[PDB]
């Protein structure tokens, strides 16, 4: 599929209660691999994957410096925006940013982006063309006009086309071993008797990575999702994931109902009956 290097940045003001809390989190193919956290004894960019320990002290010191500088820049943005929106200094507010490039198997840039959001709302975003800006409201037009006639489109494009892409390739070579990791789901079915004739068959799926999975319930090779119940794919907390689906079925007909598990880790989908 399409590989991605994305950086997730949050600055949260704490008026009275010290300086704003700042945090960057880096992702390679939607897997956390670096994280900078302002709140810490000694704030440093730290490896979150074991394979990022290959990188020497020159990498970490430079990334830390970048972060410390960004923190101070966002610390202003929070104050700047209070002005644009005629807001109160007492109030706590949140700036979020998603920076990143994604490249094909060929190693070529497919798409780059820089998205800002203030208090959950979309603020300003770098277009597909990496030249123009898109201001969500009137406050965002002030900083569009500013970044236009300051040459920020040129500077970001140089990072997104150049730096982001070159470094993604490096990170993919280093982490390939552990990024290609897939644990296929272990799956059982539990019987739950209901007051009336009806009973609840629950299809379990445990110990699988990554989270991307599909659970379905079939009767006469026909999928019933309308009268089905299933929970959002949740982390086990040991690096694996969990998800169950459950259907309510007439008592004694438990063998006509079949559960099917779809995961990239499985050589083919997995079929299940109440045993």
């Amino acid at each position: 599929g399409p590989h991605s290097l994305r950086y997730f940045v949050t600055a949260v003001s704490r008026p009275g209660l010290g300086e704003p809390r700042y945090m960057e989190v880096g992702y390679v193919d939607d897997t956390e691999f670096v994280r900078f956290d302002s709140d810490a004894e000694n704030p440093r960019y730290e490896p979150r994957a074991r394979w990022m320990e290959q990188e020497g002290p020159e990498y970490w010191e430079r990334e830390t410096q970048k972060a410390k500088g960004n923190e101070q820049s966002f610390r202003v943005d929070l104050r700047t925006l209070l002005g644009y929106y005629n807001q109160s200094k007492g109030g706590s507010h949140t700036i979020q940013v998603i920076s990143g490039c994604e490249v094909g198997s060929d190693g070529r840039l497919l798409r780059g982006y820089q998205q800002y959001a203030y208090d959950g709302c979309d603020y300003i975003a770098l277009n597909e063309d990496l030249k123009t800006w898109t201001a969500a409201d009137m406050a965002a037009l002030i900083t569009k006009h500013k970044w236009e006639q300051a040459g920020e489109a040129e500077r970001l494009r140089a990072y997104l086309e150049g730096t982001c892409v070159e470094w993604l390739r490096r990170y993919l070579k280093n982490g390939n071993a552990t990024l290609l990791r897939t644990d296929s789901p272990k799956a059982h079915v539990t019987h739950h008797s209901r007051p009336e004739d009806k009973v609840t068959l629950r299809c379990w799926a445990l110990g699988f990575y990554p989270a991307d999975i599909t659970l379905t319930w079939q009767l006469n090779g026909e999928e019933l999702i309308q009268d089905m119940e299933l929970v959002e794919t949740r982390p086990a907390g040991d690096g694996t994931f969990q998800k169950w689906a459950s259907v309510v079925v007439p008592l004694g007909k438990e063998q006509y109902y079949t559960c099917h598990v779809y995961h990239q880790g499985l050589p083919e989908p997995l079929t299940l009956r109440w045993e």
Binding site: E24, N70, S73
Partner: peptide, 10 residues
């Protein structure tokens, strides 16, 4: 390697 907000406030 992260984007450098090189003191370019909004």
């Amino acid at each position: 390697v992260t984007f450098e907000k090189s003191y370019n406030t909004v």
